[PDB]
C-alpha cells in the first residue's frame, strides 16, 4: 500500500478509459488523492475523452523509462 503499486494504472488502457475507470479502481488499491490526480491528469490532458492506444502507449513507455532512470541514480555520489 505504502509503495503504491503504480503498475495498476499502467496496466489500464483497454481502449475505453477515463478518470472514472482508473480512479475508481485505484481507490481500492489504497492510492492517495494526490497520486491518483497526478496519474490521470498526466495521461489525460483534458480528461474529457477516452484514451486511445497511441496516446496511452506513448506516455506509458515514456513514464516507465523515466521511473527507472529516475530511481536508478547515475552514481552513488549526489
From Swiss-Prot:
Start-end of Basic and acidic residues biased regions: 51-76
Domain EF-hand residue range list: 31-66
Modification after translation (UniProt): Phosphorylated. Phosphorylation is important for protein function; a mutant that lacks the N-terminal phosphorylation sites cannot complement a zebrafish pkd2-deficient mutant. PKD-mediated phosphorylation at the C-terminus regulates its function in the release of Ca(2+) stores from the endoplasmic reticulum.
Residues annotated to bind Ca(2+) 2: 44, 46, 48, 50, 55
Consequence when changing residue 55 to A: Loss of calcium-binding site
Highest taxon of source: Eukaryota
Tissues in which the protein is found: Detected in fetal and adult kidney. Detected at the thick ascending limb of the loop of Henle, at distal tubules, including the distal convoluted tubule and cortical collecting tubules, with weak staining of the collecting duct. Detected on placenta syncytiotrophoblasts (at protein level). Strongly expressed in ovary, fetal and adult kidney, testis, and small intestine. Not detected in peripheral leukocytes.
Compartment list: Cell projection, Cilium membrane; Endoplasmic reticulum membrane; Cell membrane; Basolateral cell membrane
Subunit and interaction comment: Homotetramer. Component of the heterotetrameric polycystin channel complex with PKD1; the tetramer contains one PKD1 chain and three PKD2 chains. Isoform 1 interacts with PKD1 while isoform 3 does not. Interacts with PKD1L1; probably forms a Ca(2+) channel. Interacts with CD2AP. Interacts with HAX1. Interacts with NEK8. Part of a complex containing AKAP5, ADCY5, ADCY6 and PDE4C. Interacts (via C-terminus) with TRPV4 (via C-terminus).
Pathological condition linked to this protein in its record: Polycystic kidney disease 2 with or without polycystic liver disease: An autosomal dominant disorder characterized by progressive formation and enlargement of cysts in both kidneys, typically leading to end-stage renal disease in adult life. Cysts also occurs in the liver and other organs. It represents approximately 15% of the cases of autosomal dominant polycystic kidney disease. PKD2 is clinically milder than PKD1 but it has a deleterious impact on overall life expectancy.
Family: Belongs to the polycystin family.
Function noted in UniProt: Forms a nonselective cation channel. Can function as a homotetrameric ion channel or can form heteromer with PKD1. Displays distinct function depending on its subcellular localization and regulation by its binding partners. In primary cilium functions as a cation channel, with a preference for monovalent cations over divalent cations that allows K(+), Na(+) and Ca(2+) influx, with low selectivity for Ca(2+). Involved in fluid-flow mechanosensation by the primary cilium in renal epithelium. In the endoplasmic reticulum, likely functions as a K(+) channel to facilitate Ca(2+) release.
Protein name: Polycystin-2
Shown residues in whole-protein numbering: 720 to 797 of 968
Amino acid at each position: 500500500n505504502t509503495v503504491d503499486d503504480i503498475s495498476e494504472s499502467l496496466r489500464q488502457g483497454g481502449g475505453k478509459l477515463n478518470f472514472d475507470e482508473l480512479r475508481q479502481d485505484l481507490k481500492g488499491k489504497g492510492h492517495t488523492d494526490a497520486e491518483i490526480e497526478a496519474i490521470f491528469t498526466k495521461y489525460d490532458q483534458d480528461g474529457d475523452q477516452e484514451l486511445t492506444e497511441h496516446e496511452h502507449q506513448q506516455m506509458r513507455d515514456d513514464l516507465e523509462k523515466e521511473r527507472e532512470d529516475l530511481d536508478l541514480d547515475h552514481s552513488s555520489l549526489p
